[PDB]
Structure formats: C-alpha cells, structure tokens
Amino acid sequence: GSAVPFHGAHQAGIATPVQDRLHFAAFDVTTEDRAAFVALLKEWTAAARRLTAGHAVGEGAYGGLPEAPPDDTGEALGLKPSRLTLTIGFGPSLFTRFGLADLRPEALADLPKFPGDNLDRARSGGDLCVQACADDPQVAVHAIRNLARIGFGKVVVRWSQLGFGKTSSTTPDKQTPRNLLGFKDGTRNIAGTEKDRLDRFVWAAEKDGTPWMTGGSYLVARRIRMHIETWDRASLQEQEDVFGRDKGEGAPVGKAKERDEPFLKAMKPDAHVRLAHPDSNGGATLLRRGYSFTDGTDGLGRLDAGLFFLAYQRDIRTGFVPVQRNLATDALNEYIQHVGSAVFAVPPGVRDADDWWGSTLF
C-alpha cells in the first residue's frame, strides 16, 4: 500500500514493479495556446505529486467553500497510495501543434501496417497519454478522473482502457502472472534491477539524437483481442506448441523449470517464443508491461477477453517493429487480433519539486 517515489531521472511506472491494476487514457489536445498548455502540464504535475502520495488534489475533497465544487472528487479519501504511478506520454500528432514539428524524435516512428491488423481508429492514436497503475482500481480511476477534470477545456479524453490484472513482470523474484490463455507471461522480460539492460534497451540516451528525450523511453500500445472460443477447444499439445513452453510450469519445451533458458531449436519453427526471442531478432529486446482486459460480452453469447499489450523501448524502430515483423508467421496469430494501436514518446522524469512534465520539451 506504500508510495512509489514520483521524482527521478526517469518516470516511475516503467521499471517499477508491475502493479495489479491499470487505467490507461489517451487525450487529444483542444487548445492552440502553448502557454495555456504549459500551465496545464504544471498543474497536472502538482496534482500528480499529491495523488502519488495519497493526498487530495488542490485544497482537498471537503471543508472548502460550501458554494464551490470541491478541488478533489473525493472517492479516494481514506485510501493508501497503493503504489500509484502516473506516466505521461506525447503522441506524434502532438508535434503538429505549438510549433513542435522539428522536435519530434526520429525514434517516435509511425508503425507500419501489419498482417492481420484490424485497427479501430476511434480507439487508436491520441495526442498524449497518461498511464495510471495501482494496486487499488479506485485509486487509479480517481487519478485519471481528476487529471481529466483539471484539464477541462484544454484536453479531452480520446479513449481509455482498464486492465483488471497484470500480464507482465519486472520482478523475476516474484511469481509470474498468467494471461487469459492460461500461460505465464513475463518470464523473460527486463527486470527493474537490471540497470545495464535498461540503459541498453529502454532509456533514450543523449547521443540517440533527440536531447530533450534523454532519460525518457518510447511506448507502443496494442489492444489485442483473444479468440477464446477457438483457443479453448484446442488440445493441450496445440496450446503448448503455439508457445514453446509448457502450460503448467511455464518451462521451455524439454526443460524442467520456468526460468531455465529456452533451447529454441527444440521449439516449432512458428512458436511464439522462438520468433520473439532476442536471438531471433538480432538482439532486439523489449520491456513488456501489459494487462488483461474484458469488456463484457461480444453480443454473440461469449465473454470478450483481450490483452492490452504495452512495450517500452529505447527506439521503436529497433524494438517493437522488428519483433512484431518477425511474428508474421507466429502460430499465436490464429488466436489473436490487434484492434487498437498508439505510440508515444515518454519524456524524462520530473527531477524535483520545481520541475514539471514535459519541461525539457517546452
């Protein structure tokens, strides 16, 4: 229930241990006033300092002027910080505004069209995003709600996604969670303690070409539907063949333990792990940080289930793009469909109480 420090060279919510719940929102900007937008970022940063410490925004949730609406909407009163992190990102479409065209990072690449894509344009893109992660879903919603409230008239929510449970791990010492296909998901990821691997694969560096992004990262979000009727009638051997690990232990095929190293030549040529492994992609490595979702029924008598896939990397051109290109023959494709997509540049951390979100860009 403890707090995650908000200040740092990097934003929390990336290398941070993966919290239980996600409320992810993408925002479109509705003002053309750069000064008004900078004021918003500063106001949002101040609110984030309160929210991530478990305090109410502004002057609080009650005890103010009776005839005024309260500063904070109040539904998190008496709750712990619950490991809340708030991570902000800037979308490519943002750089068409406030004269930022020449500051768009080269590493903020538009994604190509991939085979099988069925992207809903309404639930894709966005000028900016806020990823709210916490162990208490009420804490995460409260944070999104109050940020949106503070930004009224300057930003509007384009789309949002709740994740009811994590399907990722940045802490290999703790149990690996399972996704809705029933397999452990997160075994060979980057751990928050592997400082050298994060510098190598996750954090943007000064020499990479965009100085304001130094210490930031790049985020790919993909909303992925799972064909669970199709999956649930597949045999056990089929399911394990698709991945190359067994279902129970999550060990690489042939081996005894989850964390034994995969021997790829023992997996089928189209097994997901074989195709996604860094060794199959010239070393490309990702920090996966996704969550499961379910949005009611599909109107056809079945549950609607999916995975909200999130990957952080140092350069989208060298991370998600080559790996996803290599998944064109993935056996898993028979069971999933990508239906939403967005990329963001995640700026560096808020250094101290005088700093603010996006200060190095603006």
Judged by CB under 6 A, the chain residues 293 through 312 that form the site for ligand HEM are 306-307, 309
Amino acid, single-letter form, for residue 72: D
Instruction: Choose from ligand HEM, a second copy, none: what does 272 bind? Cβ within 5-8 Å by kind.
Output: ligand HEM
Instruction: Choose from ligand HEM, a second copy, none: what does 115 bind? Cβ within 5-8 Å by kind.
Output: none
User: Is the CB of 8 or the CB of 70 nearer to a second copy?
Assistant: 70
Is residue 278 within the footprint of ligand HEM (CB under 6 A)? yes
Is residue 179 within the footprint of ligand HEM (CB under 6 A)? yes
Instruction: Out of 31, 73, 171, 187, name the contact with ligand HEM by CB under 6 A.
Output: 187
Cα–Cα dist 61/158, whole Å? 27
User: Is the CB of 187 or the CB of 359 nearer to ligand HEM?
Assistant: 187
User: Is the CB of 131 or the CB of 161 nearer to a second copy?
Assistant: 161
Instruction: Draw the binding track, 110-149, toward ligand HEM (x: CB under 6 A; -: no contact).
Output: ----------------------------------------
Asked if residue 200 lies in contact with residue 190, where contact means CB atoms within 8 angstroms, the answer is no
Question: Which residues have CB under 8 Å from 44's CB, separation 6+?
Answer: 88, 147, 150, 151, 357
Comparing CA positions, the residue from 282, 250, 270 lying closest to residue 262 is: 250
Instruction: Out of 10, 23, 188, 314, name the contact with ligand HEM by CB under 6 A.
Output: 188
Instruction: Out of 14, 29, 132, 276, name the contact with ligand HEM by CB under 6 A.
Output: 276
Judged by CB under 6 A, the chain residues 196 through 235 that form the site for ligand HEM are 222, 224, 226
Instruction: Choose from a second copy, ligand HEM, none: what does 310 bind? Cβ within 5-8 Å by kind.
Output: none
Instruction: Choose from ligand HEM, a second copy, none: what does 74 bind? Cβ within 5-8 Å by kind.
Output: a second copy
Is residue 356 within the footprint of ligand HEM (CB under 6 A)? no
CA 328 vs CA 85, 118, 263, 332: distances in Å:
34, 14, 21, 10
Judged by CB under 6 A, the chain residues 51 through 90 that form the site for ligand HEM are none
Name the 3-class secondary structure at 313. strand
Is residue 10 within the footprint of ligand HEM (CB under 6 A)? no
List residues bridging with 26 in a β-sheet. 129, 159
Task: Determine phi and psi for 26, rounding to 5 degrees.
Answer: -105, 140
Instruction: Out of 145, 245, 289, 314, name the contact with ligand HEM by CB under 6 A.
Output: 245
For residue 67, count CB atoms less than 10 angstroms from its CB and return exposed for 0-12, middle for 13-18, buried for 19 or more. Answer: exposed
Is residue 348 within the footprint of ligand HEM (CB under 6 A)? no
Cα–Cα dist 325/345, whole Å? 21
Measured from the CB of residue 48, what is the shortest distance to ligand HEM in angstroms? Answer: 27
Instruction: Out of 212, 324, 341, 342, name the contact with ligand HEM by CB under 6 A.
Output: 324
The DSSP result for 234-289, as a single string, is S-HHHHHHHHTB-TTT-PBTT-SSTTSPP-GGGS-TT-HHHHHSGGGGTT---EE-
Per the listing, tokens 């964390």 go with 259
Asked if residue 24 lies in contact with residue 163, where contact means CB atoms within 8 angstroms, the answer is yes
Instruction: Choose from ligand HEM, a second copy, none: what does 328 bind? Cβ within 5-8 Å by kind.
Output: none
User: Is the CB of 84 or the CB of 286 nearer to a second copy?
Assistant: 84
Query: How far from chain centre, in Å, is Cα 65?
Result: 39
Measured from the CB of residue 17, what is the shortest distance to a second copy in angstroms? Answer: 15
Asked if residue 319 lies in contact with residue 201, where contact means CB atoms within 8 angstroms, the answer is yes
List residues bridging with 271 in a β-sheet. none
Cα–Cα dist 84/114, whole Å? 34
Judged by CB under 6 A, the chain residues 256 through 275 that form the site for ligand HEM are 262, 272-273
Residues that bind ligand HEM (CB under 6 A): 179, 181, 183-189, 222, 224, 226, 243, 245, 262, 272-273, 276-278, 286, 306-307, 309, 320, 323-324, 327, 336
